[PDB]
């Protein structure tokens, strides 16, 4: 029953990291 | 250098020091004066008379020797000779280019002073000015005469060195050549070199003045020798006597004799192998060239 | 443009410190069927810093090509004699990049050493020795320098002429990579070419632009011939530096006429007014026409030696 | 001498019906002890749960942060940049993450293991109402009494 | 306190009543020690059984961890040295090492959280070690006293 | 040590064969 | 053994002489608690002093380790991104990290060996924690008896 | 009645000279108990020093193997090969070293911490002549006696 | 002193062992 929460914790963190790198690189190229 | 000038100057006029050609030769050969003679204080008329009885001297390789004590050197002039002795000649040629363009490169009496002041970094008549421009500055200095004069100076001082080591024997002994070679290098390693040469000289062999002159020329060309030895080291083959002769032929552009070059390879054969210890060789030749 | 600056700095680090293989696989842009190749433009890019690689090609990604074939170098160009239709393979890349760098004195000495009673005689084995020694400190060119019999001797004169032609062709490519119009380069672009191997900072170049603006010099252009004459002039930088220091200590001012006089006398090259104007625009002390001989010699030395 | 006197004393006070009296006193002292113990036990349980939630939350947050770093690095070296330009950045980010974990450690600081855990919990608390040593001697007294009761019942 | 003094009087009467105070007490000590050890036996058996049952599990789990680590090593080694070169598989091995460290951490977190939540739930809803240890205390003290009385 | 080897070596060989099969499948 | 039964009779006598059985006994228990605590205080002083003098050392040592690691981090980053390239500074950083780890483990093993050697030597040549501990336990039992007597 | 009986018995047996008698009996009981304890402490010291030698030796061997591996890697990475060919070998050697360290750590397996350590050493080594339990109970009894003697000396 | 006397000989032995093993291979 723990694996569901394990996935629900990891995968959103990983996706958030991807989107944050997207946005930070965009900002840096902008300014 | 100027210390040497004040130590060896033997004429004086108006608180100003002056050298004779004999004084100048003894200065270029030695560090200290042999007889601590007082500086004779001479007057205007007398210092003019010192240069009256000249032009009796042969304008070849006996110029300075023939002038003897009959000559005058301003401190600046003495600096200009020293650089000719120590420096390679090509730099002076560059100055001849810079001074005058599209010309014979003539200099006035004042321009001669300018040349002295730049290279080594009214007035009385002097031997150089009178020789080069005539008595009253009528002729001009064409580069080739200066090149000939510099060659004659080199040759004369070299002949004097050969006589001074020969003691008037008209030929040398290879131990004396070794002495002339290692003389200036005062850093203590000379004992082992002396042992090696004394073992490997085979007394009774001789060299004449032409060999000595050719080896001094090689001394003046030494940098290409260093590049060739570095290239051999990168090849990682031990340099051998034949390879040393090939490097000498490349650097100097001349073919030295077997005996002289074999002697030099033997002396600087620091190890028991047949390989030139070229590092110390270069160091010793550098010391020798800088005097 | 942040990412572009980061990429260009990374490329400069590759050029300056990486292994001769990484520089090849990174700057090569062709793959023929399987062997990698670099068009001559890529070879020029691999030596001049601050040049950007096309986005997609980069490292270990090439334009795979299928085996009259297309010509990548103009007829008569030296790269054409490499053997391909003007393409450079790694084997030739090392050879060309070691012929560009080493000074001609070393080649003279090496040729003089490994030979038999000959000033400029060499054979293939002796040539391999020479290459090894000089690289410490060639495909399809054997016919060019030795003949079909492969026993001809390369006279040092022929090899030095080949090296000189190589430098000339690389210079023409480096010039053409600046997009000339009517055959004239922008003063700022000539300043870049001159300072390309110098300090990274572009401040002095700006100051040059302001100087030319307030001097009516920007906007006249330099032909390729003028740049060639200027580099042949720089090919005597040692004697030029000695003569400059001599004229400096003599008391004369390092003005434009002094630089053209010394150029004529010690380099046997006729400089144009504009070229002296530009050298002075980016090399004066602050405003004055006196030249900063020391820094000038420094920068010109670190530029002529390709780094 | 004193033997018959202590015999008379035993006959007087120790009526010798003391076996069942011992049984009933034991089986009620046990209940009184358990009732005296329960508050200490509930305090201990509350303290344990309150010190458990913190570590659970902190561990899950640490895993979330590791995953976020993974995502940031995998989105840099495969869409925006190349791997080779982002090799030292990843090495130094890993070094910095290890250093930050070490700094977190330095800033935050069978049955015998439980005793040590309870001692550390009491020390970190300074929370009155739960005196660990009183609870220990109390549990020990209860265990001994219950064992004696098991002997009595046989 | 009447019960306390009653038990005290009983103790004093029993102590004075004994004959061969140094002999008969040694006998009763042996009997009591034997009886207490015979009482301790079931607790020790239960403890040993539970220890073994909770130890073989961890042994198998650590063995499985080592097997999985070696399997990952084999996969990486073959890919790096047979199929694709190392230059193309540097990022894959770095990120797989990262994924493996994260999975190890996740396993530790899962086992800790599950065990502690189960323990707290069982404690809130509810082999007693305390009486076993108290029995060890009583029996060691009895054996020590017997030792002192014998020699 | 015998059991240690019998645990490691088969795991490594299984990983190698699995890498073979996965690359083929992909 | 006669002295033991005499002490039992003395306990009985102290029990029987009581007046206001639960009150004066509560008073005596209060005096006992006060006495035991006044005695306990010096041991707690010794213990807290030793604890602080052993805690500050580890704190400063860990700070020093972190500072050294940060210095190495900065040096390697500056040599990698400004002076040289990462192509040429990969083996240097790997071996510097190896050396730092080996030095940390060597320091750990050396302090362990020195500590165990010194401890065994001192034990062979020779704050009594156990009288502090039995003092804590006795005073707790007494406070518990006082509580039970209160209500 | 019975109170006067136990008072007469107090005068009879409890001579009341037992204060100084108790002092001298205690100051001798303490020596007796320490003389009893001594062999147990000797056995404990011997066992712990023998189990400490082994740990020291094994940790030294570990450091030696670490240094040997570092040596080999450095020599290859700078003399016999280039770094390019020795990156995957370096990574896989570090992986193998980690796997070996874990296989070793799997094949091997505040006073309460010391008590747990001693209990574990006794359970593992299980050598007769030393019982941790009797040693603990004797330590606590002699401690209580020292304490009573301090209270008596005042 | 013992730290250096343990590390340095081990490192030198490792270097020589890699030398010899590479020669053998
Ligand atoms: Ca790498």
Residue numbers in the entry:
A (entry chain E): 65 to 95
B (entry chain J): 86 to 206, 228 to 397
C (entry chain I): 105 to 137, 143 to 176, 184 to 253, 275 to 444
D (entry chain A), H (entry chain C): 178 to 286, 292 to 336
E (entry chain D), G (entry chain B): 175 to 300, 312 to 336
F (entry chain H): 67 to 92
I (entry chain G): 68 to 92
List sentences quoted exactly from the publication behind this structure.
The mitochondrial calcium uniporter is a highly selective multi-subunit Ca2+ channel of the inner mitochondrial membrane that serves as the major conduit for uptake of Ca2+ by mitochondria and controls ATP production in response to cytosolic Ca2+ signals. The protein MCU constitutes the pore of the uniporter through which Ca2+ ions flow and EMRE, a small transmembrane protein that associates with MCU, is necessary for Ca2+ uptake in metazoan organisms. Ca2+-dependent control is conferred by proteins that are unique to the uniporter − heterodimers of MICU1-MICU2 in most cells and of MICU1-MICU3 in neurons. At the ~100 nM resting level of [Ca2+]cytosol, MICU1-MICU2 and MICU1-MICU3 heterodimers prevent ion conduction through the channel, and they permit it when Ca2+ levels rise.
Here, we present a 3.3 Å resolution cryo-EM structure of the MCU-EMRE-MICU1-MICU2 assembly, hereafter referred to as the holocomplex, under resting [Ca2+] conditions. Cryo-EM data were collected using a low (<1 nM) concentration of Ca2+ in order to investigate the resting state of the holocomplex. Images containing one MICU1-MICU2 heterodimer per channel yielded a 3D reconstruction of the holocomplex at 3.3 Å resolution. MICU1 and MICU2 associate as a heterodimer and bind to the surface of the channel at the IMS entrance of its pore. Interactions with the channel are mediated solely by MICU1; MICU2 makes no visible contacts with MCU or EMRE. The conformation of the pore is indistinguishable from that observed in a cryo-EM structure of TcMCU-EMRE without MICU1-MICU2, which suggests that unlike gating conformational changes in many other ion channels, control by MICU1-MICU2 is not accomplished through motions of pore-lining helices. Strong density that we assign as Ca2+ on the basis of its coordination and analogy to other structures of MCU is present within the ‘E’ ring. Three EMRE subunits are observed at the periphery of the TMD (EMRE 1–3). The mouth of the pore is coordinated by Lys 126 and Arg 129 from α2, and Ser 122 of the α1-α2 turn through a network of hydrogen bonds that involves three of the four MCU-Asp 261 residues of the ‘D’ ring. The structure of the holocomplex and its similarity to a pore-blocking toxin complex indicate that MICU1 binding inhibits the flow of Ca2+ ions by both obstructing the IMS entrance of the pore and by shielding the negative charge of the ‘D’ ring through coordination with basic amino acids.
